[PDB]
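ARCHIVE RECORD
Type: protein–small molecule complex
Small molecule: S-adenosyl-L-homocysteine
Source of inputs: curated submission
Record status: active
Notes field left blank by submitter.
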Amino acid sequence: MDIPRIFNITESAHRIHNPFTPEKLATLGAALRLEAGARVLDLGSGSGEMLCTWARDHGIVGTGIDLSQLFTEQAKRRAEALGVAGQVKFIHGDAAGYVSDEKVDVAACVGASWIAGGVAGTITLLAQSLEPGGIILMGEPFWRKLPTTEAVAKACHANTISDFLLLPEFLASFRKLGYDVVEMVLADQDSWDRYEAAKWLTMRRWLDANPEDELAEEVRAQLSSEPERYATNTREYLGWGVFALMAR
Amino acid sequence: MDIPRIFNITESAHRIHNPFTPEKLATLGAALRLEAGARVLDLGSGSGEMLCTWARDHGIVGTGIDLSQLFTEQAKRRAEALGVAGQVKFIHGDAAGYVSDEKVDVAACVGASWIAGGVAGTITLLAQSLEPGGIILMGEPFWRKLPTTEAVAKACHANTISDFLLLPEFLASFRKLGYDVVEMVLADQDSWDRYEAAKWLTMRRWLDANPEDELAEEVRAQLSSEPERYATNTREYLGWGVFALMAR
Amino acid sequence: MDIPRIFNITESAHRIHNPFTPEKLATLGAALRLEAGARVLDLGSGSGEMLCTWARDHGIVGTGIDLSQLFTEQAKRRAEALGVAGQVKFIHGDAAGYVSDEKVDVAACVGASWIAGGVAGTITLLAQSLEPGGIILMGEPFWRKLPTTEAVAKACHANTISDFLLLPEFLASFRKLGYDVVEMVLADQDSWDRYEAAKWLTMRRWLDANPEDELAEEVRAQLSSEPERYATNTREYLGWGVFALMAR
Amino acid sequence: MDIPRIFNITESAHRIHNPFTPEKLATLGAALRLEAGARVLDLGSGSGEMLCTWARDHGIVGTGIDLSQLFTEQAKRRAEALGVAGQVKFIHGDAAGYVSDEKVDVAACVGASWIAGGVAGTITLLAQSLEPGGIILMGEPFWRKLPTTEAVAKACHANTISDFLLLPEFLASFRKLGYDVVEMVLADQDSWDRYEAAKWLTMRRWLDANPEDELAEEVRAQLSSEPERYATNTREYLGWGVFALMAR
Amino acid sequence: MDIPRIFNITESAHRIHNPFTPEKLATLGAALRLEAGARVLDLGSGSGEMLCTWARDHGIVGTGIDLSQLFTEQAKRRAEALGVAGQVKFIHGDAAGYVSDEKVDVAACVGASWIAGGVAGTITLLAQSLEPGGIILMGEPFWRKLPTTEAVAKACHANTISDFLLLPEFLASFRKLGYDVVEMVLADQDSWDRYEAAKWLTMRRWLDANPEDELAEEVRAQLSSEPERYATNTREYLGWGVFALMAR
Amino acid sequence: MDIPRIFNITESAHRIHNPFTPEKLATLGAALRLEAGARVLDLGSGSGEMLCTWARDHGIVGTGIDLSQLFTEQAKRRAEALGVAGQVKFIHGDAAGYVSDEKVDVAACVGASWIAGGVAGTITLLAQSLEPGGIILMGEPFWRKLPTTEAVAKACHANTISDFLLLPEFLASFRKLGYDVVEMVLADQDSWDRYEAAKWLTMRRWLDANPEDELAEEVRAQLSSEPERYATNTREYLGWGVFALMAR
Ligand SMILES: Nc1ncnc2c1ncn2[C@@H]1O[C@H](CSCC[C@H](N)C(=O)O)[C@@H](O)[C@H]1O
Ligand SMILES: Nc1ncnc2c1ncn2[C@@H]1O[C@H](CSCC[C@H](N)C(=O)O)[C@@H](O)[C@H]1O
Ligand SMILES: Nc1ncnc2c1ncn2[C@@H]1O[C@H](CSCC[C@H](N)C(=O)O)[C@@H](O)[C@H]1O
Ligand SMILES: Nc1ncnc2c1ncn2[C@@H]1O[C@H](CSCC[C@H](N)C(=O)O)[C@@H](O)[C@H]1O
Ligand SMILES: Nc1ncnc2c1ncn2[C@@H]1O[C@H](CSCC[C@H](N)C(=O)O)[C@@H](O)[C@H]1O
Ligand SMILES: Nc1ncnc2c1ncn2[C@@H]1O[C@H](CSCC[C@H](N)C(=O)O)[C@@H](O)[C@H]1O
Ligand code: NA
Ligand code: NA
Ligand code: NA
Ligand code: NA
Ligand code: NA
Ligand code: NA
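STRUCTURE (tokenized, with ligand):
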């Protein structure tokens, strides 16, 4: 099995499947003070950009599990291209209930927390793989500012305003779970632009090539509506970041 | 050991050590559809009013653990007075890490969640005592409305506004923990008045009797300031309720 | 025929199918100054709680018509349980166009006014059964405060904001129909909680028992979303009450 | 002498001539921790509901003075009906300057403070009857929220906004007089509804019976206008409560 | 009998006794798609401008009843002046309870609904004269925008804000009565100016001619105050229109 | 081919298929200073009211293309009725890509700009038919005021708020295209009422005649909801006008 086809089409040219730039991803690697040889587990690892670049830049080793066949293949090509295939392994499969045999120094789920039914569930899962004194990484949305209506929330892929919290309350929610927040690297509007806008070029080039595809009608509708939807709703209201956690 | 002396002085005449009336407490018992013989565990059971009245009215049995020696003694006198000592047992002691040998149908912590380091920790503790298909009860504050300043928060015994959530987000926080909210009974302003205002009469009568006590100066200052503090801050801004939870 | 199955599932454990507590229902009985022997007609009588309790407490007699087979059966069991079956009769059927042969002192429709196509139509219908000098009872929603968006209205089971009025304008609407408002008993937030929150426990227990039912998917979705929806929309914005009317 | 006829007509069926329910009145009795044998003086005692019910429920004894002949007669019938005539005495007369020979444990004026020219004057009067260590009870209005215009104030039976204070400032005003506030029981909107709405049924039934009375025109005008006036002005803006005071 | 003298003085030179221009009145005639021979009943027909002009322009026939002797005489002169006396009949008298013997295609009350005690009563009366498939016309005020204070309402000849509704809620009120709104023609500020400002010239010319009349003092006061009152209150806040209704 | 059936049903009795009165349409003709013999092309000409009335009043000649068979037939009957069939020709067909052989003095698209994929596309198309020094006419919506939510936009037949602009920005958009705005005639609320309200009478009369039509259910739902929807959304927020353009 796989993820739905439309995601593979829309994000086929993304290295990072989230609102983070390469510069943010490198900032995060350095913020974690990763040492050579550190072991990383990444559940929902996308196209392996985090593991591949940290292997290259910090000498880490690790494993990435992802449900997408396409993105798994990209991750493997990426590790070859960077010269780090010896350090990082990519597995195509479902990461639900995944627990590592050898403990890791960093256990991450960067924007895939439905794997264990939400943020708390995912933290509990990742904790099972974690070396005492290690770090858990959660990549998650929050309100950059509070939407004025529930409709802005539904245009940001939530059901209600209560699905997300403003940053102080979101940070508080990790504390209330039992964790210290020990680091964080947040998206800014420019990093959101990178994630969203790149989909538009990808979609248009796909559409030009696939005018009689069963999905061409749907894609054409998305391409038409997305820039304005994104600018009106997401760009102003939706925050995102990676939060580093250690259990008290 | 015990709780600090000032709490015993201020609340010596309270049956319910929270912003709930007798009528709210009975509403809660009926809302839970308690059957005769149902087993209840109550961590931080106060003066045993919940266990004693539900024993009388619904035929439940149970155990209440409380750190206060005074309130434990009151709970035992209450059970005798109601004719339910055969059904409900009160233990003087620290409820931290308390796990029941026999499972219970209802496992409760009504305004004492620091016992396991917060709401999530306490839910996890209570779950260890719970019969499959049972209910967890959490009695907790939330924002009735959002304070306009951090100072209102500090006047409501929080450190920051982020310590509490508005009701929709608070309900969402239980869902995000993995629980369905299956019932709730909330304080209203009248029930808050019962909890707070009763302290003033108690304090004044204590003060009249104990003019040379080491605490008389402190109590005199509290009595003077409390009604206005309460009316300005708590009465308008601070919500409270009991939430009934079942793990999904 | 019957009402849709989902209502029978959700409300199977409700005595009162509206945002009124037992205490509100008793307040209403006393507010009407009901005399022993007074005759009451109740169209859309639910589980007969109003007729049964007023029979017990005030010595009234009457008839309740309801389309639900389940709720009719409950009403009949309730009258037996209270010792008032001699005083109150429950009929399973459609109350549209129902006119009593003997006149009544109180003719009521408590939250079922679609029976005669709305509030005005229902008042006109009930008037046909009414003794000169009798009282008409209408149980109806109104805006507790004005929603800020049409979406809050649609989340409160209206189509538009104009479907309901703020209380002064709603009271004015009865006056403009030709009636004096002679009494009223309104829901508060606690009574709304009783009506809504009780559905959640009922639904969860049903779901646990009926995992392969054709409705399990729908019920699971409702249970997940309802507490937050209710707290965000209904609890703050939607009013409800019973209004007592006499024609000028 | 007597009170004006219109008040006797409008309130002839009220047990409590203020925005308090029976449940609030009983809450107040218990909040005061009244002991059997405690002596109560009630100036402007209405229909004696406070004295009669506290005699029945707490074993108090006392005296109620009221200017209304009707309400005095009702109070005497009430004490007989409850079996407490031996404990409570009702006197028809003017309570201005009334000082008790035997001291009392509770000296009350519940919504009649014009007797001594206002709140401060009335407190000073009641203090003359009070046992050292006793409680003074004042039943008084305040702003539940601040009216936006002087016209809302005049529709709430004040002359100006400055006639009343918001609750914190009102509580402060007792402190500034020299008293600790030691307890309080406040009206809510439901208790206001009980007080106001009951007048409408009373008025309509009176009007039906007295179509050619000199007051029928005035009463008809009041009945027409009151529900909307009440809902627009009083229900949202006007607070009321009973405050228990002890001199510092 | 007649209407009070001051109205006859103020409006003696008006053809249309409402905030409608001739152009609005003609728009309304065409909007109703009146056919030659259609029968119209007009209760409170003023100076007969609606009947006379529709007779001339659409070939309708009809009857107008008005309580003013003056305005009845004007209506009769108007029908002669337009050459339509054969088509339209004006009757001086009270239109309360008026029911036509022959049914009509259009039954109208344009700003005189106190005749049957309000909008609903008047609709019910007009319905008695109506051919199945005919139209009822109601000319009524509503809030163009919501006044900020009750005083603006009293300056617009209402008692309270709740006397009128904003247009969406007003339209909803007809729907809730059982009627489809099938057409409407609304006043604008210019049509209000025509109705109000014309009174000022009339009043001044009357005053110049009648300096010792018993009403000269009152008229002088009105003339002085009206333009500013009108501009401050009515022109911005008060809406008006004619609504065409058909029973569902 | 044709337009969908529902439009033909709803607008069968409209001469002007837009929020313009006859008086606005005549104002526009005079504003353009049309000379006898001037040639006009009208793409999406509706029922030909613009061409027919300008032929009659200004002596213009022209051609109207419309996709509706019904509205084309009406246009031809209209030209006969006005005595201008010699001057104006109506063609049933698709106006997309339509370019005139003889140049015209006025090239118009009045509320049909989807013909060339929007305002800019339509201007470019019309320009191909235009005599140097001629005028292009575009009939288009804009925001009369900015909706407070995207839902108001969707209730005004847009997808997002960004679909339309406030008038200054809308006028700027023509300037930014390369055109001077040389004249304009805008709808007001009364002209919107004419366009929308007339649909309600048409729909009701259709419904009365066609109770078993496949569309009766849909039409009944529209008739019920439209007046309130229109008053809440369109009447206050949606602007419309005809803008006269000359290329710089
Ligand atoms: N059950 C599952 N197990 C593993 N991966 C899953 C999954 N469900 C979804 N995914 C993957 O979760 C990812 C979410 S996008 C984030 C990917 C990556 N962390 C990055 O930032 O680039 C997708 O790559 C998708 O393929
Ligand atoms: N570590 C601990 N173990 C058990 N009880 C504790 C405790 N720390 C505080 N408490 C108790 O927690 C209670 C908080 S007040 C709430 C008490 C009770 N549930 C009621 O509603 O009336 C106090 O009674 C206090 O004695
Ligand atoms: N046409 C109809 N005739 C009679 N009852 C109807 C009906 N349509 C719906 N109902 C009933 O109307 C009720 C609405 S709920 C309110 C029920 C009751 N008055 C109470 O307050 O508890 C339901 O019990 C439903 O069964
Ligand atoms: N001068 C006076 N002396 C005694 N009673 C007076 C008075 N002037 C007014 N009253 C009484 O003051 C009362 C005010 S209403 C409040 C009555 C009562 N405390 C209750 O809550 O029900 C009326 O009963 C009226 O008769
Ligand atoms: N009881 C009654 N019966 C008939 N006409 C009445 C009436 N009471 C008032 N009127 C008339 O109602 C009218 C209100 S003014 C509106 C008049 C007319 N429809 C127009 O628009 O011009 C006045 O002409 C007044 O004379
Ligand atoms: N492709 C197309 N070619 C020509 N006319 C079209 C069209 N698509 C829609 N229309 C027409 O465009 C019109 C939009 S309504 C406006 C019509 C006219 N200008 C008036 O103001 O009255 C309708 O008459 C419809 O029939
Ligand atoms: Na940036
Ligand atoms: Na309350
Ligand atoms: Na309450
Ligand atoms: Na209440
Ligand atoms: Na105008
Ligand atoms: Na206008």
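CURATOR ANNOTATION: Chain C has one domain: 2-248.
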